[PDB]
Structure formats: C-alpha cells, structure tokens
Design a protein around this ligand. Structure first.
Ligand SMILES: [Mg+2]
Ligand SMILES: [Mg+2]
Ligand SMILES: [Mg+2]
Ligand SMILES: [Mg+2]
Ligand SMILES: [Mg+2]
Ligand SMILES: [Mg+2]
Ligand SMILES: [Mg+2]
Ligand SMILES: [Mg+2]
Ligand SMILES: [Mg+2]
Ligand SMILES: [Mg+2]
Ligand SMILES: [Mg+2]
Ligand SMILES: [Mg+2]
Ligand SMILES: [Mg+2]
Ligand SMILES: [Mg+2]
Ligand SMILES: [Mg+2]
Ligand SMILES: [Mg+2]
Ligand SMILES: [Mg+2]
Ligand SMILES: [Mg+2]
Ligand SMILES: [Mg+2]
Ligand SMILES: [Mg+2]
Ligand SMILES: [Mg+2]
Ligand SMILES: [Mg+2]
Ligand SMILES: [Mg+2]
Ligand SMILES: [Mg+2]
Ligand SMILES: [Mg+2]
Ligand SMILES: [Mg+2]
Ligand SMILES: [Mg+2]
Ligand SMILES: [Mg+2]
Ligand SMILES: [Mg+2]
Ligand SMILES: [Mg+2]
Ligand SMILES: [Mg+2]
Ligand SMILES: [Mg+2]
Ligand SMILES: [Mg+2]
Ligand SMILES: [Mg+2]
Ligand SMILES: [Mg+2]
Ligand SMILES: [Mg+2]
Ligand SMILES: [Mg+2]
Ligand SMILES: [Mg+2]
Ligand SMILES: [Mg+2]
Ligand SMILES: [Mg+2]
Ligand SMILES: [Mg+2]
Ligand SMILES: [Mg+2]
Ligand SMILES: [Mg+2]
Ligand SMILES: [Mg+2]
Ligand SMILES: [Mg+2]
Ligand SMILES: [Mg+2]
Ligand SMILES: [Mg+2]
Ligand SMILES: [Mg+2]
Ligand SMILES: [Mg+2]
Ligand SMILES: [Mg+2]
Ligand SMILES: [Mg+2]
Ligand SMILES: [Mg+2]
Ligand SMILES: [Mg+2]
Ligand SMILES: [Mg+2]
Ligand SMILES: [Mg+2]
Ligand SMILES: [Mg+2]
Ligand SMILES: [Mg+2]
Ligand SMILES: [Mg+2]
Ligand SMILES: [Mg+2]
Ligand SMILES: [Mg+2]
Ligand SMILES: [Mg+2]
Ligand SMILES: [Mg+2]
Ligand SMILES: [Mg+2]
Ligand SMILES: [Mg+2]
Ligand SMILES: [Mg+2]
Ligand SMILES: [Mg+2]
Ligand SMILES: [Mg+2]
Ligand SMILES: [Mg+2]
Ligand SMILES: [Mg+2]
Ligand SMILES: [Mg+2]
Ligand SMILES: [Mg+2]
Ligand SMILES: [Mg+2]
Ligand SMILES: [Mg+2]
Ligand SMILES: [Mg+2]
Ligand SMILES: [Mg+2]
Ligand SMILES: [Mg+2]
Ligand SMILES: [Mg+2]
Ligand SMILES: [Mg+2]
Ligand SMILES: [Mg+2]
Ligand SMILES: [Mg+2]
Ligand SMILES: [Mg+2]
Ligand SMILES: [Mg+2]
Ligand SMILES: [Mg+2]
Ligand SMILES: [Mg+2]
Ligand SMILES: [Mg+2]
Ligand SMILES: [Mg+2]
Ligand SMILES: [Mg+2]
Ligand SMILES: [Mg+2]
Ligand SMILES: [Mg+2]
Ligand SMILES: [Mg+2]
Ligand SMILES: [Mg+2]
Ligand SMILES: [Mg+2]
Ligand SMILES: [Mg+2]
Ligand SMILES: [Mg+2]
Ligand SMILES: [Mg+2]
Ligand SMILES: [Mg+2]
Ligand SMILES: [Mg+2]
Ligand SMILES: [Mg+2]
Ligand SMILES: [Mg+2]
Ligand SMILES: [Mg+2]
Ligand SMILES: [Mg+2]
Ligand SMILES: [Mg+2]
Ligand SMILES: [Mg+2]
Ligand SMILES: [Mg+2]
Ligand SMILES: [Mg+2]
Ligand SMILES: [Mg+2]
Ligand SMILES: [Mg+2]
Ligand SMILES: [Mg+2]
Ligand SMILES: [Mg+2]
Ligand SMILES: [Mg+2]
Ligand SMILES: [Mg+2]
Ligand SMILES: [Mg+2]
Ligand SMILES: [Mg+2]
Ligand SMILES: [Mg+2]
Ligand SMILES: [Mg+2]
Ligand SMILES: [Mg+2]
Ligand SMILES: [Mg+2]
Ligand SMILES: [Mg+2]
Ligand SMILES: [Mg+2]
Ligand SMILES: [Mg+2]
Ligand SMILES: [Mg+2]
Ligand SMILES: [Mg+2]
Lengths: 109, 72
RNA sequence: UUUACCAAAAACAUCACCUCUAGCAUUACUAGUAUUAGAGGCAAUGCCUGCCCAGUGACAAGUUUAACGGCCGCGGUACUGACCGUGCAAAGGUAGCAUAAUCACUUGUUCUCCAAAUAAGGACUUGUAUGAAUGGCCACACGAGGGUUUUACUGUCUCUU
RNA sequence: ACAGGUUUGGUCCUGGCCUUUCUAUUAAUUCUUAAUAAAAUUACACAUGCAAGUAUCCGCGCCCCGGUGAGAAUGCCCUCCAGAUCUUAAAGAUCAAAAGGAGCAGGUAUCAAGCACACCUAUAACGGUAGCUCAUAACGCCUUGCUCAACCACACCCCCACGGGAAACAGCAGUGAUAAAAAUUAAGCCAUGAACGAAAGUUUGACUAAGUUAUAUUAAUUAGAGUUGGUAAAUCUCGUGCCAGCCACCGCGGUCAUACGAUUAACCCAAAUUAAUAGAUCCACGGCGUAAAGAGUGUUUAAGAAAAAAAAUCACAAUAGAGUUAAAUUAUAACUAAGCUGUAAAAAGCCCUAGUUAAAAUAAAAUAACCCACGAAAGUGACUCUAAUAAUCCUGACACACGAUAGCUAGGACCCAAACUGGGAUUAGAUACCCCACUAUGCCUAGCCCUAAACCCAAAUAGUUACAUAACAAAACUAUUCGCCAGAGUACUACUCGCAACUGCCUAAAACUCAAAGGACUUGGCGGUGCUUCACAUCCACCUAGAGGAGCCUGUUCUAUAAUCGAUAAACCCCGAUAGACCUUACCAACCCUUGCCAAUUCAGCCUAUAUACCGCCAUCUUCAGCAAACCCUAAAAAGGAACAAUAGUAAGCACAAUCAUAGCACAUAAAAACGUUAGGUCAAGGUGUAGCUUAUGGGUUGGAAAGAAAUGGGCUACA
C-alpha cells in the first residue's frame, strides 16, 4: 500500500502452525475399538481395512492399516503416525507396522 | 460466468431464509434467553463496582435500568 | 369484585384491542352530537390472530366468520413417503404449542432432581379429542391461587414429658 | 530460490497446494571399533546412599556453585544508585535490590472504553480544584522463558509464608506411575573453582577421569537400507485382474501394470538408511474494471500533503414549501344496442354490460428530448411564485448529517396498477407462463427501517501522452493521500458489540472438506436465437400405389427342448445362406481313437475366449466438398490466413469435378465417392497378435433336432 499504511500495520508476519491429527507429536499410542472397512473416493475403487483407536490424549480417531493382511483385535495397542491417506476422506492417521501387537506384514516367499 | 459465483450466494441465501422461518421461534427463545444473560452480566459488572469501591449497598438513587430487555 | 351463613379462585371485572347500532333536542341517554352515545366480544404489553359464506342467523338477489359455527379420505410407491392415483367437500387444521387443569390408552419414552418419586422440571410427541379474539404463543411485575425443590427452624414425628 | 510439478479439449492470467535444500527429536529396518561432543517426556509421587563444612572455643560459611523453565508478556536496552562485601595510611572497587525512561519488545479489536485509575496546597494529614488513561491500542483474554561471553524467575502447593494443607531430589545417582521419548543406585578431590583456615591441609555427586547410548562430527577395521511412471537419479519376467494393494503432488490397478506383491538388472545414500512430527526458509515496497480487493454519499476531528493557475454561472429537470391543471380514466345520469371483455386458441367473468353524450374527486405527469442541465449520492424533465444551491476550494474516520425500491407504526387517500388468494385454461402435474376478478401495496402527513448489480463494477486531488500492447473492456502512466484485499469452499454463516430493527441491520470466525476455485481467450460442437437462400420424391401443400385388419409364405423375439453361432436404432429382421431331410454342421445323445491328413519336427489338430488387439472385406455420414505433406506471414502462434477497381498467402498430392460403361451423339442411370466419424459389422470366408485346450475345448461313426400359447417386421394372394 502506501508507506504510512504499511507503518500502521507494520511488517507481515507468517502465521503459527496448525497442528495435524497427531497434535504436534510425531507418533502416538492407541487402543483399538472396532476394525472395519471403508470405501475410497470416486475415480478409483477398492475397500480398505481401517481401524478406530483411543489415544493417550483421550480422543478417539479413525486410523489406517498399511499393507495387506494383519492381526488386529480390540484392546490391542498400536503406534500411530501422521501419514495421510489420499484414498479416503478424513483418514489422516496410520498405524506404524512392526511395533506392539502389529507385526510386519508377513512375508510370502 | 461470474454468475456462477453469484448463483452460489443466491442459493446459499435462499436456503438460509427457509431455515430462518422453520427455526424462527426456536431462535426467539434463544435470543431472549441471551438478553436474559446480557442484562444480568451488566448487573454483575456494576455490583462488582460497589463491592470493589467498598460500599456494601448501591449508591443512593440507583435502580439499575434494563437496557438490553428494552422493548416498545 | 363474588356465592351475608360450607367455595375468594384458575370465575367476574378491568387498562387495551375489536366488532355491530345510531345524523338527533327539553325528564333517561343529554341540557349531550359520530375522537360522541349506546348494544356486546375478548382480556393489558410484545409476536400474532391462518383457510372457509356451503349450512344457521344477521343485514340489506348479493354481503358478512374479532357471527353462530366448521376446518377429509382411501389406496400405491426410495421402516418411514417428498412423489403418484382417485374420490369427497364450503374449506380440508397453518403459525405456534404439546402427555397439558386437554376422553381413553396412562405410572407414554427418556434426561435431571432423591438412597428410592404414579410427584416436580426439561425434552420427545399424531392432540386423530391441541390450536388461534368461544383467542394461540412467549415475558415483566403482581397473587392469603394451585403445584415442586432447597436453606433455616422447630413437640409435626421417632416418642412423649 | 536459478527454481520445479499441479486447474483446462487447449492457450495465457491470477492463484494456492506440493517437491528439490538444511536441522532436531521419536519410530520401523539395519549397526564393527575406538576418539571428540551432547544427553532431554514429564514443577507428577519419591524406597536407599551421598551433595557443607572448616577450625584450638567464639566464628566464618551452609539454593554460593548446582537444578529447572513451573510462573509472568513477562522483559531487552539506558539512566540512577541504596545496602552488602573486598582493599586500605579513607576512599578506591566488585555485585548491584528498589526507583526510573530516548528507543525497541508474542498474538488477538469478535477485549473499546478502564473506573477513581489525577493534580494543587508545604499548610504538616486538613482542606481546594475535576481530573487521569485510551483507535499512535488504554483495560482485557490467550499462549510464551530469553534479545545467549549471559540475562530473568522459581525452590512442596495457598503470587507473596506470619499461619494453613501437610511432610517436599526442578542437587547426584537411582525408582514407581505417565509419555513417541529409557545414561552408572559408578571413582577420586590428582588437576581447577569454592568454603574455612596463621599454616601445613581438610571437605566439595561443582568438577576431573571414567562408565552407558549410532544422537551428531572425525577416522578406518565395518554393508546394510531406500528407491527405478512423471516432477527426479535408475527396471525385466511372472503373479493379481477397480480385486489385494500403492502415492509427497499428479495419480496407478476394469486381462497383455516399467506405479501392486515377488523376482532380475540398475540408481543413490552409506554404518547408517527411510518414515512421522517440529523448526530454519516461505507472503505485499504486490495489488484493487472483468480475477480476492475503491466502503451507497458528503463534511469534519485526529493526522498528514503543498512552486504559479486554482469564483463562473445554468441553456434551466437541485431540494422544501404554497397554490394551479392539459390529455386520459371513473362515479353517476340521458339516448342506443343486446351483447361486452379476453387470448395462439378457449373458457371463466360481467350483462348494475357496451357505444355515444354529458362530468368533479384521487392518481399520474404524451410531445418537447436526436437535449445532456441540476444535485454530494440516492435522485431530478406538467404549471406559477416564495425560500435556495457549503466552502479564496489538498486528503481525511467507526464521529456528524443523508440514502432508491420494498418494509414497519398511526391518521387520511383509493381513478388505475397489483404481491397474495380465489376462479378459467395450459399441462403427466402447473402452487407458473396465458385470462378474470380482487387485497395488502404503491399516493398524502408525521415517525421509523438504512438495504441494491446503491455499478460508470473504474477512490479522491494535481498532473502528462513521454515508456508501453498478458487477454478483453472505458488506451498507458506518475505524484500526495485515505479505504481496502493473504487458495477455494464452509460464509450477505456461528458467536460476540452497537442500533426506535426482536424472521432485521452492522461487524464477522473456526472445526470440517478439496487440490484446486477463479478472469479472459481459442477451435470446434450445439441453439424450441435473428437473418438470408435453399429441400426436388422432399419437410409442408399437392400426385399414385401400398403397409398396419384377413389367410398363407418367411425372418426375428419370447416361451417350449438334451440339442449351434452371428446381425439386432437410422446403418437387424427372405440378414452371413445366390439356400440345413443325410451331408452342409459348428449342436445335443450315446459310443469309439490318442505323433491323431503332411517330406520332417517333445509335434500335429481346436468354427475355444477375446472384432474393445488386428489384416482382410464392408456399413454409415455421403453424391458431403473437402482432406493433407512442403513453405511463408501474424507488436505470439491455443490458432488463424479471403475480399478481384483484392487487404498475406503460394502449394504439386488425393477426393469431387473431367473422361470411361451403358456399342454413335446429348441426357439419364451405372460406376466413382478422399479424410475422418459410429472401439459400427465379422476371430464361423480365410489369415493371424494375446491368452487358453493336448487319453481332449481334438478326430471319427450312429441317431436325434428345428415344437407354438403368443408378439411382431417383410412379403404373396385377395376382399370381387
Ligand atoms: Mg502415506
Ligand atoms: Mg451452497
Ligand atoms: Mg445465542
Ligand atoms: Mg360463603
Ligand atoms: Mg362480601
Ligand atoms: Mg370462607
Ligand atoms: Mg392476548
Ligand atoms: Mg377472565
Ligand atoms: Mg350463507
Ligand atoms: Mg402441526
Ligand atoms: Mg416445542
Ligand atoms: Mg388425558
Ligand atoms: Mg379441536
Ligand atoms: Mg380466525
Ligand atoms: Mg368464534
Ligand atoms: Mg370460557
Ligand atoms: Mg377450545
Ligand atoms: Mg405491569
Ligand atoms: Mg405465590
Ligand atoms: Mg387476590
Ligand atoms: Mg388480590
Ligand atoms: Mg477452472
Ligand atoms: Mg486434463
Ligand atoms: Mg472451456
Ligand atoms: Mg496438492
Ligand atoms: Mg532411538
Ligand atoms: Mg533422548
Ligand atoms: Mg517434585
Ligand atoms: Mg540459574
Ligand atoms: Mg538454565
Ligand atoms: Mg498487551
Ligand atoms: Mg539499578
Ligand atoms: Mg467471535
Ligand atoms: Mg496470563
Ligand atoms: Mg510455560
Ligand atoms: Mg511457595
Ligand atoms: Mg511455617
Ligand atoms: Mg535426579
Ligand atoms: Mg533441594
Ligand atoms: Mg519405569
Ligand atoms: Mg562423595
Ligand atoms: Mg565423557
Ligand atoms: Mg549415526
Ligand atoms: Mg557418523
Ligand atoms: Mg558388518
Ligand atoms: Mg529420468
Ligand atoms: Mg469383482
Ligand atoms: Mg501378465
Ligand atoms: Mg514413485
Ligand atoms: Mg514393484
Ligand atoms: Mg518477496
Ligand atoms: Mg488494470
Ligand atoms: Mg478468503
Ligand atoms: Mg463508488
Ligand atoms: Mg464514507
Ligand atoms: Mg453494501
Ligand atoms: Mg502538490
Ligand atoms: Mg408536502
Ligand atoms: Mg365513463
Ligand atoms: Mg390476440
Ligand atoms: Mg361464459
Ligand atoms: Mg421521450
Ligand atoms: Mg439524463
Ligand atoms: Mg436566495
Ligand atoms: Mg458549490
Ligand atoms: Mg469536492
Ligand atoms: Mg474533502
Ligand atoms: Mg430509505
Ligand atoms: Mg412505504
Ligand atoms: Mg397505512
Ligand atoms: Mg386498493
Ligand atoms: Mg373515491
Ligand atoms: Mg381493477
Ligand atoms: Mg389458480
Ligand atoms: Mg408437460
Ligand atoms: Mg411458454
Ligand atoms: Mg379495485
Ligand atoms: Mg414515494
Ligand atoms: Mg443507480
Ligand atoms: Mg451497471
Ligand atoms: Mg449511476
Ligand atoms: Mg460495490
Ligand atoms: Mg470483483
Ligand atoms: Mg475519498
Ligand atoms: Mg507523464
Ligand atoms: Mg492475441
Ligand atoms: Mg479460509
Ligand atoms: Mg444483503
Ligand atoms: Mg447475520
Ligand atoms: Mg458496530
Ligand atoms: Mg416420401
Ligand atoms: Mg428425405
Ligand atoms: Mg394391409
Ligand atoms: Mg398384415
Ligand atoms: Mg428355449
Ligand atoms: Mg437365433
Ligand atoms: Mg448376440
Ligand atoms: Mg447400432
Ligand atoms: Mg448395426
Ligand atoms: Mg429385404
Ligand atoms: Mg444335421
Ligand atoms: Mg469343436
Ligand atoms: Mg463381450
Ligand atoms: Mg470394429
Ligand atoms: Mg459383437
Ligand atoms: Mg476394421
Ligand atoms: Mg475444394
Ligand atoms: Mg498441407
Ligand atoms: Mg495452418
Ligand atoms: Mg461413350
Ligand atoms: Mg453425366
Ligand atoms: Mg453410385
Ligand atoms: Mg467421378
Ligand atoms: Mg462424390
Ligand atoms: Mg462393439
Ligand atoms: Mg481365425
Ligand atoms: Mg493363432
Ligand atoms: Mg469333437
Ligand atoms: Mg449326425
Ligand atoms: Mg398382427
Ligand atoms: Mg406385386
Ligand atoms: Mg399385391
């Protein structure tokens, strides 16, 4: 704008970050509620294996299971991370595989 | 063209008016309830002034008028 | 204000709002004259007061519901039915509100209150028998009205002296 | 940033999102050693040990080092220094509490007013004024250590600890609970610093030296991880078949996947490699007609800016009064007629109707106007008069006064118009378009409401036509300003504040979702748009003979059968068939035969799946005039490229045309008919790509089919 105007409002500052689903934490603990399946957005189609967890922050959320095949039951603990699924609406949480009651997707050799 | 921005507004306005009719009296209840919180918080704002200024009672000649609940 | 002597109220009245009737002179109304005066209605304020003149009145064949009064079915459809068929009506019950001082079912369902509530308050609600001046809905102040909670208090009571 | 990917059939423009760089934690996969550094979830609770002693008494010391970041917008910077303490022949000096301000200092104005927050008296605690702060951010609310040879703050909680809960590791180790977060209940005062000491010296979980850890660098002893569609370094064969899965962005998988799982080759990091979360970095000295952005108008306060010119007139329709009425309409009378009104066409409606002749009230103001005045904007154009258009003239708010229509309140008005509602049609329905009524409502007086596409989407005031074309449109710019704009929705929304509003106005978010949303443009295609010219068996008008009814022939479609396939809108339906009793024959029912036609072949044979893998043949637009290489132009080029008193186009090729055939001409018919379109038709003419079958999906014999309850297309023969 004009100078006086740029003086009245000062310099531009860059806005502090909006935290993700994990709320600033790189991973989180979780306890499963019900395993189920959800349908992808339009141009492509499948059915993905998905889960519901409670977190140490007390909040319940939808998280996703990467890989094919798994052993997941209620009350099983998992480590979750901030990977966002492109396929599904609003599923921003992903179970890290290889820790706790989720072992690596089993080799077929 | 630009109509397509404007058309949105039109629908988005119309769909509002409809709501405001159906939700109308519900909205009156909530509104008048909200003035009923208003006038009260006004009151506390003044009572806090006596009780900070040390006087127990309100100053002489104070009825503390209702502005927010004013009608007619 | 009311049943003098079993009812003081949620009845009546009432500011307000509304209809109808009246163009005028020595006893009422009135020594007035339509912003007036009579016959009523409903109850201030605030938001409102939907559709119906076929019936019965009323007025002047025609007109009137802030006059008496009314304000629907029976099937088919994505558990529900926006949609469709068809009939009947003068119109087909809206806005609200809702288990109510509202036939029954009925101690409706649920939430709060309590150790426990057929109580009380909040919701939900087809009430097929709510509902708009035979007024509907909120709201202030008010009430020897009618219910429920808490404080405090006690010979009400344990349980009497 | 030297930038890159990502909106569209495509091109620019605007514009977010993402990648490529560097750092820190944790995790998943791996990890040989040593060296240097750094070690940290948790102002949650703390088992056990230790962290203050020294010294002839007294005394000196005992959050000093050390810990932590809980709290507080705290504070950095800069004056000014009390007091503690050191030195000493009394002033030097080290910290520096408190008190202060040139200046700077987290977000939020949807926190806009705080509520005694000031001063005068030197009189000596009484009186006297009415102030102080604040849109240059007062008063709040939220979150936070730090500007780093250090600084600030806390020490179990009640900011402060007299008292109260209650029984304190935010000293070093270690331990529960919790968290994505995991060092030794280790050794000495030997070096330094500190505490005492006259002094040897004593103590010190400060510290020194170790010990534990891939957490970061160095170095070798040590090789494992990620990737290979694009951006972005690098791929082969299987498997799977919109499934299982994958991706940071675009996206990949629907039977041939370089994107998935697994190989193979490779690429790039390397004792590490990837993933996740935070940082560092990242807007606008850019912009505001059409893209997000100039508020509906004017004035002023604050606060700014400035050479000289900067008051001339209506070509006449500011505003507010008071009076007036020209054409029309209508009350309501008098003649006349039975009809009048209304649409594409009709009904309804009115016949207290229509025509003509008379006539006030209310309303509204032909022509002049092809004008371009007035007003700040909204606005203002029938007539006359009264009042009257701020400013020696830059800008200026949330303050002040205005503001079309519609709307609200009260009192009048009502010729006409008219939401609404009620009839009538139109229609599957018509809550509408079309007709008939008729109301609020437009009109006057007072008071509100304060919104418009209030738009000329172009801010005000000086200037200039110099530089210059994103695109379009109203050509391009400086200078001083004021207002405004940080992806798209969510949103003229939710909460807030204020307002004669209480379905209102104003001001105005976020969770969530997406990878776009948008401005202009280009070529098509289409248009129940307008205009011109046509259709020649061709749409209407017109001519002739038929079909749909009947019988029968034949083809489909359903049902029927153990019992083919294919075509199936125009462009299937006497269709591949110019031809099924066996055969043809693909089919079903049984039976039989396994180098099973050939010169040879771990080889033959397959009317098995794919016509959306194709060649061949064709249909169709189409009896349509174009289609395409080679060039050349266009203040950019997606693309377009003609005018004959011609303006940027030239072009061989191939269609059409021309010639051939119909036994001479001419005509007509025949043929011809490019490019592409319909993934149009056919793997059953045949041939093949890919997949399958191989004592069978192959090859033979024998017998069996094709029945009609219907439904229909086409024909033939008729009804004389
Ligand atoms: Mg991911
Ligand atoms: Mg919308
Ligand atoms: Mg509210
Ligand atoms: Mg009595
Ligand atoms: Mg009495
Ligand atoms: Mg009594
Ligand atoms: Mg009432
Ligand atoms: Mg009563
Ligand atoms: Mg009647
Ligand atoms: Mg109802
Ligand atoms: Mg209710
Ligand atoms: Mg009952
Ligand atoms: Mg009833
Ligand atoms: Mg009524
Ligand atoms: Mg009644
Ligand atoms: Mg009664
Ligand atoms: Mg009743
Ligand atoms: Mg009262
Ligand atoms: Mg009472
Ligand atoms: Mg009483
Ligand atoms: Mg009383
Ligand atoms: Mg777009
Ligand atoms: Mg595209
Ligand atoms: Mg387009
Ligand atoms: Mg993206
Ligand atoms: Mg680790
Ligand atoms: Mg660590
Ligand atoms: Mg502690
Ligand atoms: Mg410290
Ligand atoms: Mg520190
Ligand atoms: Mg502040
Ligand atoms: Mg100081
Ligand atoms: Mg807010
Ligand atoms: Mg605070
Ligand atoms: Mg903090
Ligand atoms: Mg304390
Ligand atoms: Mg104490
Ligand atoms: Mg410790
Ligand atoms: Mg301590
Ligand atoms: Mg532990
Ligand atoms: Mg020790
Ligand atoms: Mg060490
Ligand atoms: Mg390492
Ligand atoms: Mg290293
Ligand atoms: Mg090794
Ligand atoms: Mg490459
Ligand atoms: Mg499937
Ligand atoms: Mg394959
Ligand atoms: Mg990739
Ligand atoms: Mg792969
Ligand atoms: Mg920049
Ligand atoms: Mg521009
Ligand atoms: Mg925005
Ligand atoms: Mg403007
Ligand atoms: Mg303004
Ligand atoms: Mg506006
Ligand atoms: Mg100047
Ligand atoms: Mg006037
Ligand atoms: Mg007339
Ligand atoms: Mg006509
Ligand atoms: Mg008629
Ligand atoms: Mg004109
Ligand atoms: Mg004009
Ligand atoms: Mg004058
Ligand atoms: Mg002037
Ligand atoms: Mg001016
Ligand atoms: Mg000015
Ligand atoms: Mg106005
Ligand atoms: Mg009006
Ligand atoms: Mg009125
Ligand atoms: Mg009227
Ligand atoms: Mg009249
Ligand atoms: Mg009329
Ligand atoms: Mg109608
Ligand atoms: Mg139709
Ligand atoms: Mg039409
Ligand atoms: Mg009328
Ligand atoms: Mg007007
Ligand atoms: Mg305008
Ligand atoms: Mg305009
Ligand atoms: Mg204008
Ligand atoms: Mg505007
Ligand atoms: Mg705009
Ligand atoms: Mg301006
Ligand atoms: Mg210039
Ligand atoms: Mg161009
Ligand atoms: Mg947004
Ligand atoms: Mg608006
Ligand atoms: Mg609003
Ligand atoms: Mg405001
Ligand atoms: Mg024909
Ligand atoms: Mg034709
Ligand atoms: Mg026939
Ligand atoms: Mg026939
Ligand atoms: Mg069959
Ligand atoms: Mg067949
Ligand atoms: Mg077929
Ligand atoms: Mg076809
Ligand atoms: Mg075909
Ligand atoms: Mg034929
Ligand atoms: Mg045969
Ligand atoms: Mg065969
Ligand atoms: Mg097929
Ligand atoms: Mg084909
Ligand atoms: Mg086919
Ligand atoms: Mg072909
Ligand atoms: Mg040509
Ligand atoms: Mg060419
Ligand atoms: Mg070209
Ligand atoms: Mg010839
Ligand atoms: Mg010829
Ligand atoms: Mg031909
Ligand atoms: Mg030819
Ligand atoms: Mg041709
Ligand atoms: Mg096909
Ligand atoms: Mg073949
Ligand atoms: Mg083959
Ligand atoms: Mg065979
Ligand atoms: Mg046979
Ligand atoms: Mg037939
Ligand atoms: Mg014949
Ligand atoms: Mg014949």
């Amino acid at each position: 704008a004009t100078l006086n105007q740029m003086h009245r409002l000062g310099p531009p500052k860059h806005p502090p970050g909006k935290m993700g689903p994990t709320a600033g934490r790189p991973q989180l603990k979780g306890v499963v509620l019900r395993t189920f399946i959800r349908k992808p957005k339009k141009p492509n189609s499948a059915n993905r294996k998905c889960c519901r967890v409670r977190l140490s922050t007390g909040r319940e959320a939808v998280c996703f299971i990467p890989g094919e095949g798994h052993s997941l039951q209620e009350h099983h603990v998992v480590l979750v991370q901030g990977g966002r699924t492109q396929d599904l609406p609003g599923v921003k949480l992903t179970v890290v595989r290889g820790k706790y009651d989720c072992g690596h997707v089993q080799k077929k050799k | 063209k630009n109509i397509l921005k404007i058309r949105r507004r039109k629908m988005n306005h119309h769909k509002y008016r409809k709501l405001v009719k159906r939700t109308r009296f519900l909205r009156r209840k909530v509104r008048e309830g909200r003035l009923r919180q208003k006038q009260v918080k006004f009151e506390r704002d003044l009572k806090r002034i006596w009780q900070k200024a040390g006087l127990k009672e309100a100053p002489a000649g104070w009825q503390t008028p209702k502005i927010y609940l004013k009608n007619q």
